[PDB]
Amino acid sequence: VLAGWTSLLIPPTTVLIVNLVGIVAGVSYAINSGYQSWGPLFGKLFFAIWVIAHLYPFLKGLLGRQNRTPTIVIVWSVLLASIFSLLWV
Amino acid sequence: RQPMSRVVPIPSSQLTPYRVVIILRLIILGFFLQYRVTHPVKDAYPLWLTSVICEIWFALSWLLDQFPKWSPINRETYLERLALRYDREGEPSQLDPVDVFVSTVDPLKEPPLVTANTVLSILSVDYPVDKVSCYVSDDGSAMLTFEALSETAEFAKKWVPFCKKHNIEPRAPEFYFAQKIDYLKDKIQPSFVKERRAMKREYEEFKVRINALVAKAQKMPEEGWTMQDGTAWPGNNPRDHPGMIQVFLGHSGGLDTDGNELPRLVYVSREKRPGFQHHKKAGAMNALIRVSAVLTNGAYLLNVDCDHYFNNSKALKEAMCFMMDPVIGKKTCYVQFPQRFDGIDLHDRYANRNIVFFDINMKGQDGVQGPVYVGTGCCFNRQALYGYDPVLTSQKSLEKRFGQSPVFIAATFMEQGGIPPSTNPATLLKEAIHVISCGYEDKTEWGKEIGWIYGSVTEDILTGFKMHARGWISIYCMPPRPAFKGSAPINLSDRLNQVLRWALGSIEIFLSRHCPLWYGYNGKLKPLMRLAYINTIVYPFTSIPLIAYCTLPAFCLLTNKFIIPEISNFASMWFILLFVSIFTTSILELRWSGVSIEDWWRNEQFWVIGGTSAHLFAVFQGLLKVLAGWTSLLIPPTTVLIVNLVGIVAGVSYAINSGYQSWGPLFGKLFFAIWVIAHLYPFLKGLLGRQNRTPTIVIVWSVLLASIFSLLWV
Amino acid sequence: ALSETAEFAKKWVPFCKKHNIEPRAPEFYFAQKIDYLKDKIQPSFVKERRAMKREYEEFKVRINALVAKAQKMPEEGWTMQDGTAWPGNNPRDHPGMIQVFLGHSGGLDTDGNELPRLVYVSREKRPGFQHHKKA
């Protein structure tokens, strides 16, 4: 309007990878902290599993039988997730 | 002038990271051993020694297994170029003659129906009728097999023209009619609906006739079997039957419904006498080769098992695309086809497909010199089986090597095949009977340098190694549609029996001569092929470190300490690095090979259980037999399973009694010993569950052995 | 339904006796997906099975037609094929009837032999008396 494939599957891949790596690293860092704070950890554990559960058919479609995922999509998703992870720092 | 077949290297996009993770594995595995040597446990010193020994053996196994798979390749065929070059239209074909060998021993255990289906499938291959022949060899000299072959030949006159006209796939009537897939997919021919109904109604009556013969041949008449002609069956005694040769279909055998001819079918039964060893399959194969040379003298010999049928009718043409090429045909010893099985479970509980072996290891072996001979679905070059050296771009000796039949010696010289003009066809039957006699191989080189090699139950590996030692190379081809399909076992006991047979054969080869280590030092065998042969022969021997590693948990946890020290600087770094890289190479393997994760995981589970169940007994039998001239094969995994389960339960309960703030040891002993149960999970499912096949005596023996172990802990 | 079953038994029974069909019930035997050509020695079995299946399907059609035709009570009561009214028009005031379908003189099957005797028994029921049902 302002100016007169297979990439349609990438943003969920970035969200999936980012959330998975994030929660894993964060729980490990919580183990390193070893604090008596159930509230924050439980809140961040119940959350971000809701996302994976709602993206569970996505994960099954990407990895499993009857796969239809080009390698270029995986490479692009990894690159975008790398930019996001570097942006966090 | 364009190449008949093309070799396609794996793209560098997938190949380069594979080598990068391989070298990274080497660097990070040569340092884990150093870190684990510099940290001995002063309270678990023998246990620490056992763990480090197991790790050393596992690392060496991984290295010698991953070296052959460094440079895999693929092959593609162009059948259109074959049609344009040799299979021209409006002209007799120049295709070399081919002979297909089928071997059977007992019709009682192996039903004649599957053998009849295999014969029908072979007789209906997409090949010229006058350039192909079939030889069926019965080791037991069975009357039922003879009549089954006769009925199969009678039914072939109706089955073959229908398949040729309507392009029926597969050619086996049983498997074709059993398919539930829509048969009206691309059938252009109008007169196909009516013919299919009649052909099905005729196959059902053929099955009825076969069943009637099988039912009638369950007891031996006291006066012996009598043929339809009236003369008694010569093979009344399976040990004193003289050699018989019978031809069913051929030039003068008869005409089919369309008036054409059919490929020649020959029934061969060798002469057996008491007091002489016949070597079973190897002797039968040698007899078949000699008889085929005398009768038809085919250029190439394709070996097909009785339970394997042609799923693709153009397998012979694809093989000829490799063997008949002038540049890669004068140095090719055999072409190996992948083995596929049907009628199996969707999950493939018993891992009968062998995905990893047949789509990863075979390609890596083909990358250097070619795949190893594995039995069924192999097309051999006739000149290679005679011990002749490859070409790369004497009467006394001939009689000593081959035999005392001048017809076979003369037929040897025919490198392109076909009956020599000097040899009159009037006396081609008496000479064949002369060769089939049991006193032919005496004082000859058969079974030592020429043809199949004796001295092993798994006598296929030795033959391939002997052929490769002379400088020959083999070709691995993968058609889009599998060329051969067989019936896989559906029993844990049967699968373990065949694994035990293979491992025992490898051990028997290792202790005897003709090994890759002390034999083959001629300078023509590539070192990487030597490594692959060494791995295939040795991999029995890795069982003892494996069972020690799987016996570690209960013995360690019932006592104190562990194989691991406290986590500190540089301590857990190597742990995570090794674990991550171990999981890292797997995804690249699946990526380039195309193997699903479930298949690889199932192969890992089978590797563990077969490492226990069959391999220690293979080593034990070989060692004891060499130094000294059922259902127990399932016991050691049962002892390991029970010992580990009871151990971890008691140890965690004792940890509850202690109630200490030590997460490290408990977590280490909890994550471990669940790995063992997970890798033995199909074992637990097989023992306890539906379709149980566990005798009570096995359970009693396992309980007794576990009781001795538990009392030994105290 | 019993009359039609007796009519069809003259064709079903000899086939089962000759070819050792298991189970004897046509519905469950034909509904099995297991390979029926397991141990059938008899040569004239493939042709007979097709005809027997094509006859059982028509028997099922006839039974379905009878069931569909017997969903409503005619206002004048049911009438048999002979013409006489059905005695059991009222399920509570029906006098006892006994009818024999197959037997010694009932008829011969396709092979000319006989069939086991089949008897249809309906007891007499009157109002004001307990019948104890199955007992």
CA distance B401 to B301: 20
Min CA distance, B573 vs chain A (Å)? 15
> Which residue out of C37, C38, C47 would a mutagenesis test of the B interface target, given it has the greatest number of B Cβ atoms within 10 Å?
C37
B586 is in an annotated binding site: no
Q: What chains are in contact with B, requiring at least 3 Cβ pairs below 8 Å?
A: A, C
Name every residue in B having a CB less than 8 A away from some CB of C: 201, 204-205, 207-209, 211-212, 215
Asked if B639 contacts B702 with a C-beta cutoff of 8 angstroms, the reply is: yes
Verify whether the Cβ–Cβ distance B205 to C39 is below 8 Å.
no
Residue count of chain A, please give it.
89
Contacts (Cβ under 8 Å, ≥6 apart) of B548: B50, B53, B54
**Method of determination?**
cryo-EM
CA distance B708 to B697: 17
B445: tokens are 């080189």
B679: tokens are 């890798």
> Which residue out of B572, B584, B587, B596 would a mutagenesis test of the A interface target, given it has the greatest number of A Cβ atoms within 10 Å?
B596
C15: tokens are 């086939």
CA distance C108 to C111: 8
Count other Cβ atoms within 10 Å, centred on residue B589.
Answer: 18
Min CA distance, B218 vs chain C (Å)? 13
CA angle B200, B201, B204 (to 5 degrees): 85
Verify whether the Cβ–Cβ distance A71 to B597 is below 8 Å.
no
Contacts (Cβ under 8 Å, ≥6 apart) of B463: B373, B451, B452, B453
Verify whether the Cβ–Cβ distance B208 to C39 is below 8 Å.
no
Count other Cβ atoms within 10 Å, centred on residue B360.
Answer: 20
CA distance B579 to B562: 18
Min CA distance, C32 vs chain B (Å)? 15
Identify the helix (H) or strand (E) that includes residue B335.
strand B332-336
Grouping H, G, I as helix, E, B as strand and the rest as coil, residue B80 is helix
Asked if B376 contacts B484 with a C-beta cutoff of 8 angstroms, the reply is: yes
**Which residue among B307, B366, B460, B599 is the active-site one?**
B460
Chain A residue at shortest CA distance from B588:
A71
CA distance B205 to C41: 11
Chain breaks in chain A (C to N over 2.5 A) after: 4
Contacts of B597 in chain A (CB under 8 A): 63-64
Verify whether the Cβ–Cβ distance A71 to B13 is below 8 Å.
yes
Q: Is position B460 annotated as part of the catalytic site?
A: yes
In which region does residue B99 sit, left (phi positive, over 0), alpha (psi from -120 to 50) or beta (all else)? Answer: beta
Cα B609 from chain centre: 20
B575: tokens are 């742990």
Asked if B295 contacts B268 with a C-beta cutoff of 8 angstroms, the reply is: no
Contacts of B205 in chain C (CB under 8 A): 43, 46
| Alpha helix stretches (DSSP H) within B225-343 | 281-295, 315-323
C67: tokens are 């069931």
Query: Resolution to 1 decimal, in Å?
Result: 3.3
Contacts of C45 in chain B (CB under 8 A): 208
Q: Is position B258 annotated as part of the catalytic site?
A: no
Verify whether the Cβ–Cβ distance B201 to C43 is below 8 Å.
no
Classify each residue of B274-310 as buried b or exposed e, where b means 16 or more C-beta atoms within 10 Å of its C-beta.
eeeebbebbbbbbbbbbbbbbbbbbbbbbbbbbbbbb
Q: What type of residue is B55? A: E
Nearest residue to B168 (alpha-carbon basis) of B121, B205, B129: B121
Asked if B305 contacts B127 with a C-beta cutoff of 8 angstroms, the reply is: no
**Which residue among B138, B139, B366, B599 is the active-site one?**
B139
Min CA distance, B204 vs chain C (Å)? 7
Q: Which member of C37, C39, C41 has the closest CB to residue B204?
A: C37
Contacts (Cβ under 8 Å, ≥6 apart) of C130: none
B305 is in an annotated binding site: yes
In total, the C-beta contacts within 8 angstroms joining chain A to chain B are 7
